[PDB]
Coordinates of C-alpha atoms and ligand atoms in Angstrom, one line a residue:
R19 CA 0.0 0.0 0.0
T20 CA 1.3 3.4 -1.1
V21 CA -0.1 6.8 -2.2
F22 CA 1.3 9.5 -4.5
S23 CA 0.4 12.7 -2.7
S24 CA 2.9 15.5 -3.5
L25 CA 5.2 16.9 -6.2
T26 CA 8.6 18.5 -6.6
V27 CA 9.2 20.5 -9.8
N28 CA 12.9 21.4 -10.7
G29 CA 13.9 21.0 -7.0
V30 CA 11.0 23.0 -5.5
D31 CA 8.6 21.1 -3.2
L32 CA 5.0 22.3 -3.8
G33 CA 3.6 21.0 -0.5
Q34 CA 1.6 18.1 0.8
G35 CA -1.4 17.4 -1.4
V36 CA -0.7 20.4 -3.7
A37 CA -1.6 19.9 -7.3
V38 CA -2.5 16.2 -6.7
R39 CA -5.9 14.5 -6.4
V40 CA -5.0 12.5 -3.3
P41 CA -7.0 9.4 -2.6
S42 CA -8.3 9.2 1.0
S43 CA -7.3 5.6 1.2
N44 CA -4.1 3.7 0.4
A45 CA -6.3 0.8 -0.7
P46 CA -5.5 -0.4 -4.2
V47 CA -7.4 -0.1 -7.3
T48 CA -7.9 -3.7 -8.6
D49 CA -10.5 -3.4 -11.4
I50 CA -8.7 -2.3 -14.5
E51 CA -12.1 -1.9 -16.3
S52 CA -13.2 0.7 -13.7
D53 CA -12.9 4.5 -14.2
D54 CA -10.9 4.2 -10.8
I55 CA -8.0 3.0 -13.0
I56 CA -7.7 6.5 -14.5
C57 CA -6.9 8.7 -11.4
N58 CA -8.1 6.5 -8.4
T59 CA -11.1 7.6 -6.4
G60 CA -12.3 9.0 -3.0
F61 CA -10.2 12.1 -3.0
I62 CA -9.5 14.1 0.0
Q63 CA -11.8 17.1 -0.2
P64 CA -11.6 19.8 -1.2
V65 CA -9.3 18.8 -4.0
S66 CA -6.3 21.1 -4.7
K67 CA -7.0 23.8 -7.3
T68 CA -3.3 24.3 -7.9
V69 CA -1.9 23.5 -11.3
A70 CA 1.9 23.2 -11.1
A71 CA 3.8 25.1 -13.9
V72 CA 6.5 22.7 -15.3
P73 CA 8.8 23.6 -18.2
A74 CA 9.0 21.0 -20.9
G75 CA 12.3 19.2 -20.2
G76 CA 11.9 19.8 -16.4
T77 CA 12.5 17.3 -13.7
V78 CA 9.5 16.2 -11.6
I79 CA 9.4 14.1 -8.5
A80 CA 6.2 12.3 -7.7
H81 CA 6.2 11.5 -4.0
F82 CA 4.8 8.2 -2.7
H83 CA 4.3 7.5 1.0
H84 CA 2.6 4.7 2.8
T85 CA -0.5 6.7 3.7
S86 CA -2.5 9.5 2.1
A87 CA -1.0 11.9 4.8
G88 CA 2.5 12.0 3.2
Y89 CA 5.5 11.9 5.4
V90 CA 4.7 11.3 9.1
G91 CA 8.1 10.0 10.3
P92 CA 9.8 6.6 10.2
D93 CA 7.8 3.7 9.0
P94 CA 9.2 0.4 7.7
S95 CA 6.5 0.3 5.1
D96 CA 7.1 3.9 3.8
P97 CA 6.9 4.5 1.0
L98 CA 5.7 0.9 0.5
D99 CA 6.4 -2.5 2.1
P100 CA 9.2 -3.6 -0.2
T101 CA 8.0 -7.2 -0.3
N102 CA 5.5 -5.7 -2.8
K103 CA 7.5 -6.1 -6.0
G104 CA 6.4 -4.4 -9.2
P105 CA 6.9 -1.5 -11.7
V106 CA 6.4 2.2 -11.4
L107 CA 5.0 4.1 -14.4
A108 CA 4.2 7.7 -15.3
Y109 CA 1.8 9.0 -18.0
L110 CA 0.5 12.3 -19.3
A111 CA -2.8 13.3 -20.9
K112 CA -3.5 16.6 -22.4
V113 CA -6.7 18.2 -20.8
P114 CA -8.6 21.5 -21.4
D115 CA -8.3 22.3 -17.7
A116 CA -6.1 20.3 -15.2
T117 CA -8.8 21.1 -12.5
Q118 CA -11.7 19.6 -14.5
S119 CA -13.7 16.9 -12.6
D120 CA -14.2 14.5 -15.6
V121 CA -11.1 12.5 -16.3
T122 CA -12.7 10.0 -18.7
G123 CA -12.1 9.9 -22.4
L124 CA -8.5 11.3 -22.2
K125 CA -5.5 10.1 -24.2
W126 CA -2.6 8.9 -22.1
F127 CA 1.0 8.6 -23.2
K128 CA 3.7 7.0 -21.1
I129 CA 6.7 9.1 -20.3
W130 CA 8.6 6.9 -17.8
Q131 CA 8.7 3.5 -16.3
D132 CA 10.9 1.3 -14.2
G133 CA 10.1 -2.4 -14.4
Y134 CA 12.3 -5.3 -13.6
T135 CA 16.1 -5.6 -14.3
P136 CA 17.0 -9.3 -14.6
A137 CA 20.8 -8.9 -14.1
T138 CA 20.3 -7.2 -10.7
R139 CA 16.9 -8.9 -9.8
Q140 CA 15.7 -5.4 -8.9
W141 CA 12.2 -3.9 -9.4
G142 CA 11.1 -0.3 -9.8
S143 CA 9.4 -0.7 -6.5
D144 CA 12.7 -1.5 -4.8
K145 CA 14.3 1.7 -6.3
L146 CA 11.2 3.7 -5.2
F147 CA 11.7 2.3 -1.7
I148 CA 15.5 3.2 -1.7
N149 CA 14.6 6.6 -3.0
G150 CA 12.3 7.4 -0.1
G151 CA 9.2 7.3 -2.4
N152 CA 10.7 9.7 -5.0
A153 CA 9.7 8.7 -8.5
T154 CA 11.9 11.1 -10.5
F155 CA 11.4 11.6 -14.3
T156 CA 11.6 14.3 -16.9
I157 CA 8.8 15.9 -18.8
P158 CA 9.6 15.4 -22.6
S159 CA 11.2 18.6 -24.0
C160 CA 9.3 18.6 -27.3
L161 CA 5.7 18.6 -25.9
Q162 CA 3.0 21.1 -26.8
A163 CA 2.6 23.6 -23.9
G164 CA -0.7 23.5 -22.0
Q165 CA -2.6 21.8 -19.2
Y166 CA -2.0 18.1 -18.6
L167 CA -2.8 15.4 -16.0
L168 CA 0.2 13.4 -14.7
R169 CA -0.9 9.8 -13.8
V170 CA 1.8 8.1 -11.7
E171 CA 1.4 4.5 -10.6
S172 CA 3.0 1.9 -8.4
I173 CA 1.8 -1.7 -9.1
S174 CA 2.2 -4.5 -6.6
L175 CA 2.4 -7.9 -8.2
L176 CA 2.6 -9.8 -4.9
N177 CA -0.9 -11.4 -5.5
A178 CA -1.0 -11.1 -9.3
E179 CA -0.9 -14.9 -10.2
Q180 CA -4.6 -14.4 -11.1
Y181 CA -6.8 -11.4 -12.1
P182 CA -8.0 -9.6 -10.1
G183 CA -4.7 -9.7 -8.1
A184 CA -2.4 -6.9 -9.3
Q185 CA -2.7 -3.9 -6.9
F186 CA -2.7 -0.4 -8.6
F187 CA -1.7 2.5 -6.5
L188 CA -2.0 5.8 -8.4
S189 CA -2.9 9.4 -8.4
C190 CA -3.1 12.2 -10.9
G191 CA -1.1 15.4 -10.6
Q192 CA -2.3 18.7 -12.2
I193 CA 0.3 20.4 -14.3
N194 CA 0.8 23.2 -16.9
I195 CA 3.6 22.4 -19.2
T196 CA 5.4 25.6 -20.3
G197 CA 7.8 26.2 -23.2
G198 CA 8.1 23.0 -25.2
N199 CA 7.5 22.6 -28.9
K200 CA 4.6 21.2 -30.8
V201 CA 4.6 17.5 -30.3
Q202 CA 1.3 15.9 -29.3
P203 CA 1.9 12.2 -28.8
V204 CA -0.6 9.4 -29.6
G205 CA -2.1 8.1 -26.4
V206 CA -4.2 5.2 -25.1
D207 CA -7.5 5.0 -23.2
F208 CA -8.0 4.4 -19.6
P209 CA -9.8 2.2 -18.9
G210 CA -8.8 0.1 -21.8
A211 CA -4.9 0.1 -22.0
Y212 CA -4.6 -2.5 -19.3
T213 CA -6.3 -5.9 -19.9
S214 CA -6.6 -9.1 -17.9
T215 CA -4.4 -11.1 -20.4
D216 CA -1.5 -8.6 -20.1
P217 CA 1.6 -10.5 -18.7
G218 CA 2.6 -7.3 -16.9
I219 CA -0.7 -7.6 -14.9
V220 CA -1.0 -11.3 -14.5
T221 CA 2.3 -12.8 -13.4
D222 CA 3.8 -14.9 -10.6
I223 CA 6.8 -12.7 -9.2
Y224 CA 8.3 -15.9 -7.7
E225 CA 8.3 -17.2 -11.5
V226 CA 9.6 -13.9 -13.1
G227 CA 12.6 -14.2 -15.5
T228 CA 11.8 -11.3 -17.7
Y229 CA 9.0 -8.7 -17.2
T230 CA 7.4 -6.1 -19.4
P231 CA 5.3 -3.5 -17.6
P232 CA 1.7 -3.0 -18.9
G233 CA 0.6 -0.4 -21.3
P234 CA 2.2 1.3 -24.3
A235 CA 5.8 2.0 -25.0
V236 CA 7.5 5.0 -23.4
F237 CA 7.2 8.1 -25.5
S238 CA 10.4 10.0 -26.0
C239 CA 11.2 13.0 -28.2
Ligands
LIG4 O1 -20.4 6.9 -9.8 C1 -20.1 7.3 -8.4 C2 -18.6 7.7 -8.2 O2 -18.3 8.8 -9.1 C3 -18.3 8.2 -6.8 O3 -16.9 8.4 -6.6 C4 -16.6 9.8 -6.2 C5 -16.6 10.7 -7.4 O4 -16.5 12.0 -7.0 C6 -15.2 12.2 -6.3 O5 -15.0 13.6 -5.9 C7 -14.6 14.4 -7.0 C8 -13.1 14.7 -7.0 O6 -12.7 15.4 -8.1 C9 -13.4 16.7 -8.2 O7 -12.9 17.3 -9.4 C10 -12.1 18.4 -9.4 C11 -10.8 18.1 -8.9 O8 -9.9 19.2 -9.2 C12 -10.2 20.3 -8.4 O9 -9.2 21.3 -8.7 C13 -11.6 20.8 -8.8 O10 -12.1 22.0 -8.0 C14 -12.6 19.7 -8.7 O11 -13.9 20.0 -9.3 C15 -14.9 16.6 -8.1 O12 -15.4 18.0 -8.0 C16 -15.4 15.8 -7.0 O13 -16.8 15.5 -7.1 C17 -15.0 11.4 -5.1 O14 -13.8 11.7 -4.5 C18 -15.3 9.9 -5.5 O15 -15.3 9.1 -4.3 O16 -18.8 7.2 -5.9 C19 -20.2 6.8 -6.1 C20 -20.4 6.2 -7.4 O17 -21.7 5.7 -7.5
LIG5 C1 13.5 12.9 -2.4 O1 13.1 14.2 -2.8 C2 13.4 15.3 -2.0 C3 12.9 16.5 -2.7 O2 11.6 16.6 -2.5 C4 14.8 15.3 -1.5 O3 15.0 16.3 -0.5 C5 15.8 17.4 -0.8 O4 17.2 17.0 -1.1 C6 17.9 18.2 -1.6 C7 19.3 17.9 -2.1 O5 19.5 16.5 -1.7 C8 17.9 19.3 -0.6 O6 18.4 20.5 -1.2 C9 16.6 19.6 0.0 O7 16.8 20.5 1.1 C10 15.8 18.4 0.3 N1 14.4 18.6 0.7 C11 13.8 17.9 1.7 C12 14.6 16.9 2.5 O8 12.6 18.1 2.0 C13 15.3 13.9 -0.9 O9 16.7 13.9 -0.7 C14 14.9 12.8 -1.8 N2 15.1 11.5 -1.0 C15 15.8 10.6 -1.4 C16 15.9 9.4 -0.5 O10 16.4 10.7 -2.5
MAN6 C1 15.9 17.9 -14.0 O1 16.8 17.6 -13.0 C2 17.6 16.4 -13.0 C3 18.7 16.4 -11.9 O2 18.0 16.8 -10.7 C4 18.3 16.2 -14.3 O3 18.9 14.8 -14.2 C5 17.3 16.3 -15.5 O4 18.0 16.3 -16.7 C6 16.6 17.7 -15.4 O5 17.6 18.8 -15.5

């Protein structure tokens, strides 16, 4: 169990809950056909009306912690219990307004992931743990400026030998990409991008040799 609940943009911490729709619970989403797979559900109200300005090319940190409160001191399961092996992923979708309530029917492109590295037997989740819940990635330099949602996700595959089983821990940040260029990548639907036959979603982690995280290939300029 883990929750993405704060952002840092080019080394500046925005504050707990700022520009993120923070779920009230650290309970996972498990239904990949639910609209809950888009940006989670049950947000702490009132939801932030901050939209973080981020230059295209800028470095973002999405902060995960064990609970929706963020950092509350030492905890052996903060940011997650590292027995929960799996990937970490980040997607963007262009939106008319990053504070709009309706997140359905958006087109999501993947900008970062960290899956499994066979030679070191290390998962993205292990690195997230080592990094104190910091999922650090760059916003592609060539993107069209404007408002976007930033969907960042930690998947636990501990119970993923069947479907349902995989546990999806995700939130959406609210950003305004500045500068940039004119690229508007092709995206995928949520729900829809993840299916019950995807071997990134149904897998035995005690039988992993190679692993491919679910969803489309990472977009890069
Ligand atoms: O079908 C029903 C489900 O939808 C429901 O789940 C709840 C759906 O409403 C959620 O609250 C939302 C949170 O998002 C707000 O949107 C904006 C977020 O950005 C802000 O900057 C802006 O001001 C907000 O407008 C939206 O206003 C608010 O309603 C709630 O958290 C979910 O639990 O459950 C019942 C199902 O039957
Ligand atoms: C995770 O991210 C935070 C940024 O939110 C890092 O904290 C900052 O570290 C820099 C340089 O190391 C300092 O200038 C800031 O004063 C720190 N801010 C804090 C502690 O709130 C933090 O080091 C990262 N954690 C890990 C384990 O990498
Ligand atoms: C944002 O910051 C990181 C270093 O903190 C860089 O690695 C990245 O290229 C971007 O400048």
